Amino acid sequence: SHITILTLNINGLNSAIKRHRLASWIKSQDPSVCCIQETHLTCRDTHRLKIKGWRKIYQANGKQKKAGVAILVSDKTDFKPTKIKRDKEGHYIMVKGSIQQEELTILNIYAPNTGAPRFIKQVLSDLQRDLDSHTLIMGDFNTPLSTLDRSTRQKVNKDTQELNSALHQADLIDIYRTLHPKSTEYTFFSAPHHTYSKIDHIVGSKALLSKCKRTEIITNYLSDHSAIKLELRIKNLTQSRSTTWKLNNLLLNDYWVHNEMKAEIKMFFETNENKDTTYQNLWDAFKAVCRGKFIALNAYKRKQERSKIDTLTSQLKELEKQEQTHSKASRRQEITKIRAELKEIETQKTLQKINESRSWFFERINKIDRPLARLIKKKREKNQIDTIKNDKGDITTDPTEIQTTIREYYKHLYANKLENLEEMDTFLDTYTLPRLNQEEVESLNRPITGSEIVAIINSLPTKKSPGPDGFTAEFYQRYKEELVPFLLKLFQSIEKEGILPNSFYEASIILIPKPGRDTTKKENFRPISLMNIDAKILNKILANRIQQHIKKLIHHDQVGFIPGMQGWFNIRKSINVIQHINRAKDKNHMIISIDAEKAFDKIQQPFMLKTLNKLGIDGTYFKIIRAIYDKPTANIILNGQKLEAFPLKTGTRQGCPLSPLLFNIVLEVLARAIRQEKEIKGIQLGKEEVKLSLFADDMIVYLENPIVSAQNLLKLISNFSKVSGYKINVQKSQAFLYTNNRQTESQIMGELPFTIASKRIKYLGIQLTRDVKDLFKENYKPLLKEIKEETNKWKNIPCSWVGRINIVKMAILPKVIYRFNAIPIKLPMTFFTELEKTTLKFIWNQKRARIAKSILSQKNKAGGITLPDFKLYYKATVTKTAWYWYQNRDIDQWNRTEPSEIMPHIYNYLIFDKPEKNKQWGKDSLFNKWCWENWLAICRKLKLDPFLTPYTKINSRWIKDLNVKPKTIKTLEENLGITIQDIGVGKDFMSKTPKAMATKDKIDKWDLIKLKSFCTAKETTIRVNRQPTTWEKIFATYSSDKGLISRIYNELKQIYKKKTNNPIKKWAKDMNRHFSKEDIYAAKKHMKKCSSSLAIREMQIKTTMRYHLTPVRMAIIKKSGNNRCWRGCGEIGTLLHCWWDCKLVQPLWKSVWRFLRDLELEIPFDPAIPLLGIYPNEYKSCCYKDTCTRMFIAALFTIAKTWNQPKCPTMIDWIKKMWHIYTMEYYAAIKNDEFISFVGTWMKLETIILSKLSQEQKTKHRIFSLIGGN
DNA sequence: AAAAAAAAAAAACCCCCCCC
DNA sequence: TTTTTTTTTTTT
DNA sequence: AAAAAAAAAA
RNA sequence: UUUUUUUUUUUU
Ligand SMILES: [Zn+2]
């Protein structure tokens, strides 16, 4: 074990290019401690010095840029700071701490150019209290210490003699001189004297000499100073930071890497396959060899990308050593030239990397993506853990104790395994469970095919962290066309044998701190399990196979992880139950929210296997399931260190795509046990018996007569947990009590161990209320409070208005949509007006709405930027229930639990059905009546007939009013169809197919007469045989509810097209011109299509929508006569003047038009073309639209930069904007494989720009040729 | 009689880009 | 000049 | 019928 | 810093 400390004078850290030079340089050496002198920074600039992998940065700076120091500690160093102090002027900084339980003090000092020895002596005198045997004083001393430190072999002056005497007094010696008495290496070059001297020194107490190993001076190209590396021996307390290898996506994207990697895979699979080894061990060897080859390719890539750098570095070292031996001017000139060339090439490399990053950020500058989501989101808490309460009860910091305690805790969590199989079988036998038939069990046991593997791999989410092997989903996706055969062979092997590779058993658990909880307690840490991609592929194949039948295996009461089943089914059902209990004249009911204590990790694997056997699952599928849970294990990745693996004897392996389905199956045994237990009394809502409802492990149990029912439920829960491990926290589980006598409530409190909430309980993020009359108060008022709180949090968020529009869509809209879905009750207009005011105040940053919310409320015709309409989303959510009304699915028990004292089955007969017979129904209804009222509202708004439609069901009242026998109506439904159009009307009555007369043959004559009398009537014929609009198709055609809210919202937006002013027509009025509909369509399309990135579209939206503010507008606002044009003209300051007719902006437009003339484009000098994108009918050619679009948008950016600045906007700024967009779009295109289009649209523009730019401006603005004729 | 659409009146805050 | 809010009228 | 992103619940 | 389900938005 050794510690490396590096010193370096750098002479400024202000250039954004220069700081990245530090990041690459420091990471290249990878030292334990790196210190920086002469940062040329102030106090307020400390926030800018951030380096990846070095989180411990201590910066001391003054009020002016004359000095500055910093001490940095790498993340791989076990450093515990103890004392930190900073000099006022930033000339020096010292940090004292313990590395591997050994004291070490670092004093980084940047001496002044004049009087350095006196300053160093004063610093030593001031720091005498901190000096010790483990204290190092080092940095730029600006003076040699010995004769051998000068190339001229000259003695030191009197000041340096005083400094040496002070060092001797302070018991300090030169470590570098002691280790290398005859060394002549130098770090500084004095230009006026043409001499070399060593002015950077490291000194310390002689006690450290017992640990000193070696030291050297490594010359640097960063500045004129040379770095010094000191290596010291330390006690062997090294942390085993063997970071798990991971396959980054950048390495995969390289074509040469792709070719060599596929060649290596092919060669391995052609040589290392045989009859003597199984496919599992061969697959493990394949993974190991792939990891080795990937490491080798990454290493050679790192070597080749640094080939020229390394060559110039070697030449620099040779010339520097020769100069140190004897100084010559020619060698100095050669060193200067080669250093300049190397600096230029490395600066180009840094520009390439930073431009890649900036283009990635710019393509998603304001879109719905990571840069915005992480912008609004709070800074993610570090996963490193430094303090955990141990088993004894003491607060400890020792990393080995923390690791041992956390590993023992997570091992004991998964080690409680039960072996009582007899009790398991008895419990499974006691209560009936569904069984799959032969067809479904053969569907499960069907062989795996290559197409299934391709579909599974193509569905794998990307950008997800890999498992222990470090192989990501992109590895399988890119190499799929070679990986399907051998993955298929492996899967056939595991089907035949039932043995999985050892990689399928290992998982990586990462600990995440729970927000709002104590991070010093081990029990407030969320365990997240990561799996290898192949294991996830197999598990997801099995999950899909069992998901094809999970509808039969799982009752509809459980909605978690069930496809086509939505969470709010339980919320609405629970609210309806609460309403019924409230309406009951005598209250003897209980509603429990069972809080399971880590149910996912407490389900016994043997119980899972026994349950799967009892459900009729056998063959290859059950064998594979057993093989998965044969020897599972996981290891905790704590502080980046892989801990010892511990077995998963019990619990279901999280992070597995198949795990939720297995947990649902296991919990369904308990669910059916509760439902089939007659001693547990549910709540009877007419013909619907409601006992319990499930969402994953979250369970709600409704009971009647709780005194006996709750005890029976607890007894059955204990019996279930004795065989499955499903432990519940009964003392924490919240519940309601509804009792008509307080003594009974007290007795129930005494007997039961549940805790009863007086007002609300949380359930699926929804605050269920004891009295449903307070649903709005307990669910929507806090919603507005939270929305206002987040708005205030993002009051000064650094984004434009489109960024905040997308923020509203991305963070506020989903929560509001979910709350609407859960509780779509009649909401007063006050709530919506407050929500709209809060959102709008957020959007415009407390300013007035520059662009009317009515314009942005429109579709993409407003510019592809939509402001969310919360009223329309509310209406869509309310009307969504009508779809479930029409479908009348048997699994929708939530819709049949609405209280009603009349018309028990009505909700299936409103959609496309005769109106109620003047019956006042749903008086106490909470969700259905409002949905019906809204449905009628939109139906009347459409001038539509909502009572008879081509989609009217056969089961509808339109045929049941004719006293038709049931058997006839079932026959019609089964043989013909669902809608009346299938039967036929008028001349088409039962005549659209020979099957029509066939079914007529087995129809009762009276019912057939009634059907003929009804269908052939003229009114029915016209009302049926008409083309249905989109609104009818939304609720009748699709049998799937996926994307229902989107379609209803789009249709409602089309319906509620409020009249809006068209500001493009206002623009036309400004320039005394009239635009046709073609011109407006072209302007809108240009606004939507201006550029792929959102900033350019935002600029075009701002200029076309008259977002920018005009001087006459201000004169009117202030009610004053100061309507004169800004920047000084003497003319009126209208918007068209500010954009086009301004005398101070005309030269820029003349330069632009000269550029178009150089493009051989005779575009007329008409402001519509650049300001709005409207082209004359004579210039419909699209071979140049993109180029001129980019030039005009850059001109608009430049003009907007100088909106009121009296200076004329300059052509060089316009070219600078061109090159900013050039870099952004080029790197976006090279990332998106759009090279050909990018060249085709900017090649001539780049040529013209380079021809019109002088060499000095090109060099100073980093403008140069970047693409070729490729 | 209640809900939805339209018209009239009033009040706003002299830039605009930039900013991960 | 443009936007939002309130008020008045009309229709279901 | 694909890709990407977010959010909600567990 | 996973897994599943559901929901929305944008780009064809
Ligand atoms: Zn002007």
Side-chain angles (χ1 to χ4, degrees), chain A residues 40-77:
Chain A
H40 189 239
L41 300 177
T42 71
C43 297
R44 300 170 295 169
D45 304 321
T46 59
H47 75 274
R48 284 196 180 91
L49 190 63
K50 304 297 178 185
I51 295 171
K52 186 168 181 175
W54 293 69
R55 296 174 298 168
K56 296 180 176 71
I57 305 173
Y58 318 101
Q59 303 176 242
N61 295 286
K63 289 183 178 180
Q64 295 185 304
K65 299 180 183 187
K66 299 179 183 175
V69 282
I71 294 173
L72 285 83
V73 178
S74 65
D75 294 344
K76 71 168 176 172
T77 299

Short mmCIF file of all heavy atoms in Angstrom, two decimals, chain A residues 40-77:
data_model
loop_
_atom_site.label_atom_id
_atom_site.label_comp_id
_atom_site.label_asym_id
_atom_site.label_seq_id
_atom_site.Cartn_x
_atom_site.Cartn_y
_atom_site.Cartn_z
N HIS A 40 -5.48 31.54 -9.81
CA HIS A 40 -5.90 32.80 -10.41
C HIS A 40 -7.42 32.96 -10.30
O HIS A 40 -8.11 33.35 -11.24
CB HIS A 40 -5.43 32.88 -11.87
CG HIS A 40 -5.63 34.22 -12.51
ND1 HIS A 40 -6.39 34.38 -13.65
CD2 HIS A 40 -5.20 35.45 -12.16
CE1 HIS A 40 -6.41 35.66 -13.98
NE2 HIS A 40 -5.69 36.33 -13.10
N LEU A 41 -7.94 32.64 -9.11
CA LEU A 41 -9.37 32.62 -8.85
C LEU A 41 -9.70 33.46 -7.62
O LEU A 41 -8.82 33.79 -6.82
CB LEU A 41 -9.89 31.19 -8.63
CG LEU A 41 -9.71 30.19 -9.77
CD1 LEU A 41 -10.20 28.81 -9.36
CD2 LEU A 41 -10.42 30.66 -11.03
N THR A 42 -10.98 33.81 -7.48
CA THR A 42 -11.47 34.54 -6.33
C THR A 42 -12.32 33.63 -5.44
O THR A 42 -12.46 32.43 -5.68
CB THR A 42 -12.28 35.76 -6.77
OG1 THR A 42 -13.53 35.33 -7.33
CG2 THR A 42 -11.52 36.57 -7.80
N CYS A 43 -12.88 34.23 -4.38
CA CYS A 43 -13.71 33.47 -3.45
C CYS A 43 -14.97 32.94 -4.11
O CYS A 43 -15.38 31.80 -3.87
CB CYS A 43 -14.06 34.33 -2.24
SG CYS A 43 -12.65 34.87 -1.25
N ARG A 44 -15.60 33.76 -4.96
CA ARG A 44 -16.86 33.38 -5.58
C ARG A 44 -16.69 32.37 -6.71
O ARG A 44 -17.70 31.86 -7.22
CB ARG A 44 -17.58 34.62 -6.11
CG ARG A 44 -17.92 35.65 -5.05
CD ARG A 44 -18.40 36.95 -5.67
NE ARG A 44 -17.35 37.59 -6.45
CZ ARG A 44 -17.55 38.62 -7.27
NH1 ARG A 44 -18.76 39.13 -7.45
NH2 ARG A 44 -16.52 39.13 -7.94
N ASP A 45 -15.46 32.07 -7.12
CA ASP A 45 -15.21 31.14 -8.20
C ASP A 45 -14.98 29.71 -7.72
O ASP A 45 -14.69 28.83 -8.54
CB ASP A 45 -14.00 31.59 -9.03
CG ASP A 45 -14.16 33.00 -9.57
OD1 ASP A 45 -15.28 33.35 -9.98
OD2 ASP A 45 -13.16 33.75 -9.59
N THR A 46 -15.10 29.45 -6.42
CA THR A 46 -14.87 28.11 -5.89
C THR A 46 -15.92 27.11 -6.37
O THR A 46 -15.63 25.91 -6.41
CB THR A 46 -14.84 28.14 -4.36
OG1 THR A 46 -16.09 28.65 -3.87
CG2 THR A 46 -13.70 29.01 -3.87
N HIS A 47 -17.12 27.57 -6.72
CA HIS A 47 -18.16 26.67 -7.18
C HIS A 47 -17.88 26.09 -8.56
O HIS A 47 -18.56 25.14 -8.97
CB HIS A 47 -19.51 27.39 -7.21
CG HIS A 47 -19.66 28.35 -8.35
ND1 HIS A 47 -19.23 29.65 -8.29
CD2 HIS A 47 -20.21 28.19 -9.58
CE1 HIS A 47 -19.49 30.26 -9.43
NE2 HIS A 47 -20.09 29.39 -10.23
N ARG A 48 -16.90 26.63 -9.29
CA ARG A 48 -16.66 26.22 -10.66
C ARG A 48 -15.66 25.07 -10.79
O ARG A 48 -15.66 24.39 -11.82
CB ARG A 48 -16.15 27.42 -11.48
CG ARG A 48 -17.23 28.41 -11.86
CD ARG A 48 -16.76 29.33 -12.98
NE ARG A 48 -17.77 30.30 -13.36
CZ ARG A 48 -17.90 31.50 -12.81
NH1 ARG A 48 -17.08 31.92 -11.86
NH2 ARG A 48 -18.87 32.31 -13.24
N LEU A 49 -14.83 24.83 -9.77
CA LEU A 49 -13.79 23.81 -9.83
C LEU A 49 -14.38 22.49 -9.34
O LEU A 49 -14.36 22.19 -8.15
CB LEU A 49 -12.57 24.23 -9.01
CG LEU A 49 -11.32 23.37 -9.18
CD1 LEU A 49 -10.81 23.44 -10.61
CD2 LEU A 49 -10.24 23.80 -8.20
N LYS A 50 -14.90 21.70 -10.28
CA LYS A 50 -15.46 20.39 -9.98
C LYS A 50 -14.84 19.36 -10.91
O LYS A 50 -14.80 19.57 -12.13
CB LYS A 50 -16.99 20.39 -10.13
CG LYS A 50 -17.69 21.44 -9.28
CD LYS A 50 -17.46 21.18 -7.79
CE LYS A 50 -18.12 22.26 -6.94
NZ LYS A 50 -17.81 22.08 -5.50
N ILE A 51 -14.35 18.26 -10.34
CA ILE A 51 -13.68 17.21 -11.09
C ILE A 51 -14.32 15.88 -10.73
O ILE A 51 -14.51 15.57 -9.54
CB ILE A 51 -12.17 17.17 -10.80
CG1 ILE A 51 -11.50 18.45 -11.30
CG2 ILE A 51 -11.53 15.95 -11.43
CD1 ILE A 51 -10.06 18.60 -10.86
N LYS A 52 -14.67 15.09 -11.74
CA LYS A 52 -15.23 13.77 -11.50
C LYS A 52 -14.18 12.85 -10.88
O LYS A 52 -13.02 12.83 -11.30
CB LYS A 52 -15.75 13.17 -12.81
CG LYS A 52 -16.48 11.84 -12.63
CD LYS A 52 -17.21 11.43 -13.89
CE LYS A 52 -17.96 10.12 -13.69
NZ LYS A 52 -18.78 9.75 -14.88
N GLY A 53 -14.60 12.09 -9.88
CA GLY A 53 -13.72 11.20 -9.16
C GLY A 53 -12.94 11.84 -8.04
O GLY A 53 -12.23 11.13 -7.31
N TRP A 54 -13.04 13.16 -7.88
CA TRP A 54 -12.38 13.90 -6.80
C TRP A 54 -13.44 14.77 -6.14
O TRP A 54 -13.59 15.95 -6.49
CB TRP A 54 -11.21 14.72 -7.34
CG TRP A 54 -10.07 13.88 -7.85
CD1 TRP A 54 -10.08 13.09 -8.97
CD2 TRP A 54 -8.77 13.75 -7.27
NE1 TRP A 54 -8.86 12.48 -9.11
CE2 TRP A 54 -8.04 12.87 -8.09
CE3 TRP A 54 -8.15 14.30 -6.15
CZ2 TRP A 54 -6.72 12.52 -7.81
CZ3 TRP A 54 -6.84 13.95 -5.87
CH2 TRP A 54 -6.14 13.07 -6.70
N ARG A 55 -14.17 14.20 -5.19
CA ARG A 55 -15.26 14.91 -4.53
C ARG A 55 -14.79 15.77 -3.36
O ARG A 55 -15.55 16.62 -2.90
CB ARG A 55 -16.31 13.92 -4.03
CG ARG A 55 -17.01 13.14 -5.13
CD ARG A 55 -17.93 12.08 -4.55
NE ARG A 55 -17.19 11.08 -3.79
CZ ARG A 55 -17.76 10.17 -3.00
NH1 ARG A 55 -19.07 10.11 -2.85
NH2 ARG A 55 -16.98 9.31 -2.35
N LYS A 56 -13.56 15.57 -2.89
CA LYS A 56 -13.03 16.32 -1.75
C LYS A 56 -12.14 17.43 -2.29
O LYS A 56 -10.93 17.26 -2.45
CB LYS A 56 -12.27 15.39 -0.80
CG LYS A 56 -13.14 14.33 -0.15
CD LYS A 56 -12.33 13.44 0.78
CE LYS A 56 -13.21 12.43 1.49
NZ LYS A 56 -13.72 11.38 0.57
N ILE A 57 -12.75 18.58 -2.56
CA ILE A 57 -12.05 19.75 -3.09
C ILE A 57 -12.12 20.86 -2.05
O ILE A 57 -13.22 21.29 -1.67
CB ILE A 57 -12.64 20.21 -4.43
CG1 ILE A 57 -12.65 19.05 -5.43
CG2 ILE A 57 -11.85 21.38 -4.98
CD1 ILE A 57 -13.38 19.36 -6.72
N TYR A 58 -10.96 21.32 -1.60
CA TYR A 58 -10.87 22.40 -0.62
C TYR A 58 -10.10 23.55 -1.26
O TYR A 58 -8.90 23.43 -1.52
CB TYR A 58 -10.17 21.93 0.65
CG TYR A 58 -10.59 20.55 1.11
CD1 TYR A 58 -9.80 19.44 0.86
CD2 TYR A 58 -11.80 20.36 1.78
CE1 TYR A 58 -10.18 18.18 1.27
CE2 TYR A 58 -12.19 19.10 2.20
CZ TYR A 58 -11.38 18.02 1.94
OH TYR A 58 -11.77 16.76 2.35
N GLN A 59 -10.79 24.67 -1.50
CA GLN A 59 -10.23 25.80 -2.21
C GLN A 59 -10.15 27.02 -1.30
O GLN A 59 -11.12 27.35 -0.60
CB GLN A 59 -11.06 26.14 -3.45
CG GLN A 59 -11.21 24.99 -4.42
CD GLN A 59 -12.12 25.32 -5.59
OE1 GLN A 59 -13.16 24.69 -5.78
NE2 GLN A 59 -11.73 26.31 -6.38
N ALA A 60 -8.99 27.68 -1.30
CA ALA A 60 -8.79 28.93 -0.59
C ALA A 60 -8.39 29.99 -1.61
O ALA A 60 -7.45 29.79 -2.38
CB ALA A 60 -7.71 28.79 0.49
N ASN A 61 -9.11 31.11 -1.60
CA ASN A 61 -8.89 32.17 -2.58
C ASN A 61 -9.11 33.52 -1.93
O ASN A 61 -9.75 33.63 -0.88
CB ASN A 61 -9.81 32.01 -3.80
CG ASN A 61 -9.53 30.74 -4.59
OD1 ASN A 61 -8.53 30.65 -5.31
ND2 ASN A 61 -10.40 29.75 -4.45
N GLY A 62 -8.56 34.56 -2.56
CA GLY A 62 -8.68 35.92 -2.09
C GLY A 62 -9.73 36.70 -2.86
O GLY A 62 -10.52 36.15 -3.64
N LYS A 63 -9.73 38.02 -2.64
CA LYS A 63 -10.68 38.90 -3.30
C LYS A 63 -10.27 39.27 -4.72
O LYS A 63 -11.12 39.74 -5.49
CB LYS A 63 -10.87 40.18 -2.49
CG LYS A 63 -11.64 39.99 -1.19
CD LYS A 63 -11.85 41.32 -0.48
CE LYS A 63 -12.66 41.14 0.79
NZ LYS A 63 -12.88 42.43 1.50
N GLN A 64 -9.01 39.05 -5.09
CA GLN A 64 -8.52 39.39 -6.42
C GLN A 64 -7.79 38.19 -7.01
O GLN A 64 -7.32 37.31 -6.29
CB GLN A 64 -7.58 40.60 -6.39
CG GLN A 64 -8.26 41.90 -5.98
CD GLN A 64 -7.32 43.09 -6.07
OE1 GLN A 64 -6.25 43.11 -5.47
NE2 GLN A 64 -7.73 44.10 -6.84
N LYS A 65 -7.71 38.17 -8.34
CA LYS A 65 -7.06 37.07 -9.06
C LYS A 65 -5.55 37.31 -9.14
O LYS A 65 -4.99 37.67 -10.18
CB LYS A 65 -7.68 36.92 -10.45
CG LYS A 65 -9.16 36.59 -10.44
CD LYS A 65 -9.72 36.46 -11.84
CE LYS A 65 -11.21 36.21 -11.80
NZ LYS A 65 -11.76 35.91 -13.16
N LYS A 66 -4.89 37.10 -8.00
CA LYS A 66 -3.44 37.15 -7.92
C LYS A 66 -2.82 35.89 -7.34
O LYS A 66 -1.63 35.66 -7.54
CB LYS A 66 -2.99 38.35 -7.07
CG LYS A 66 -3.42 39.70 -7.62
CD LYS A 66 -2.97 40.84 -6.72
CE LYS A 66 -3.47 42.18 -7.24
NZ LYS A 66 -3.13 43.29 -6.30
N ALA A 67 -3.60 35.07 -6.64
CA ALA A 67 -3.12 33.84 -6.05
C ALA A 67 -4.28 32.84 -6.02
O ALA A 67 -5.29 33.04 -6.70
CB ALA A 67 -2.53 34.11 -4.65
N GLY A 68 -4.13 31.78 -5.25
CA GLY A 68 -5.17 30.77 -5.14
C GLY A 68 -4.62 29.36 -5.10
O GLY A 68 -3.77 29.00 -5.91
N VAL A 69 -5.09 28.56 -4.14
CA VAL A 69 -4.62 27.20 -3.96
C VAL A 69 -5.81 26.29 -3.73
O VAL A 69 -6.91 26.73 -3.37
CB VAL A 69 -3.62 27.09 -2.79
CG1 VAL A 69 -2.25 27.59 -3.22
CG2 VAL A 69 -4.12 27.88 -1.60
N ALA A 70 -5.58 24.99 -3.93
CA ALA A 70 -6.61 23.99 -3.73
C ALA A 70 -5.96 22.66 -3.39
O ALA A 70 -4.89 22.33 -3.90
CB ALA A 70 -7.50 23.83 -4.98
N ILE A 71 -6.61 21.90 -2.51
CA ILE A 71 -6.17 20.56 -2.13
C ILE A 71 -7.30 19.59 -2.45
O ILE A 71 -8.43 19.77 -1.99
CB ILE A 71 -5.78 20.49 -0.64
CG1 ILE A 71 -4.55 21.35 -0.37
CG2 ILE A 71 -5.54 19.05 -0.22
CD1 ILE A 71 -4.20 21.48 1.10
N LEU A 72 -6.98 18.56 -3.23
CA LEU A 72 -7.97 17.61 -3.72
C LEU A 72 -7.60 16.21 -3.27
O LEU A 72 -6.43 15.83 -3.29
CB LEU A 72 -8.08 17.67 -5.25
CG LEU A 72 -8.80 18.87 -5.85
CD1 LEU A 72 -7.87 20.07 -5.98
CD2 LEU A 72 -9.40 18.51 -7.20
N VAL A 73 -8.61 15.44 -2.86
CA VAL A 73 -8.44 14.05 -2.44
C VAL A 73 -9.33 13.17 -3.30
O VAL A 73 -10.53 13.44 -3.44
CB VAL A 73 -8.77 13.87 -0.95
CG1 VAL A 73 -8.62 12.41 -0.56
CG2 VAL A 73 -7.87 14.75 -0.09
N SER A 74 -8.75 12.12 -3.88
CA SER A 74 -9.49 11.24 -4.77
C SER A 74 -10.48 10.39 -3.99
O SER A 74 -10.32 10.14 -2.79
CB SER A 74 -8.53 10.35 -5.55
OG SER A 74 -7.84 9.46 -4.68
N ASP A 75 -11.53 9.94 -4.69
CA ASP A 75 -12.54 9.10 -4.07
C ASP A 75 -12.01 7.73 -3.67
O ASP A 75 -12.60 7.08 -2.81
CB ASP A 75 -13.74 8.94 -5.01
CG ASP A 75 -14.47 10.24 -5.25
OD1 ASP A 75 -14.25 11.20 -4.48
OD2 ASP A 75 -15.26 10.31 -6.22
N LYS A 76 -10.91 7.29 -4.28
CA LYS A 76 -10.31 6.01 -3.92
C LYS A 76 -9.46 6.08 -2.66
O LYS A 76 -8.98 5.05 -2.19
CB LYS A 76 -9.47 5.47 -5.08
CG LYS A 76 -8.17 6.24 -5.30
CD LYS A 76 -7.25 5.49 -6.25
CE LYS A 76 -6.00 6.30 -6.56
NZ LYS A 76 -5.00 5.51 -7.33
N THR A 77 -9.26 7.28 -2.11
CA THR A 77 -8.46 7.47 -0.91
C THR A 77 -9.38 7.49 0.31
O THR A 77 -10.37 8.22 0.33
CB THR A 77 -7.66 8.77 -0.99
OG1 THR A 77 -6.76 8.71 -2.10
CG2 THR A 77 -6.86 8.98 0.29
#
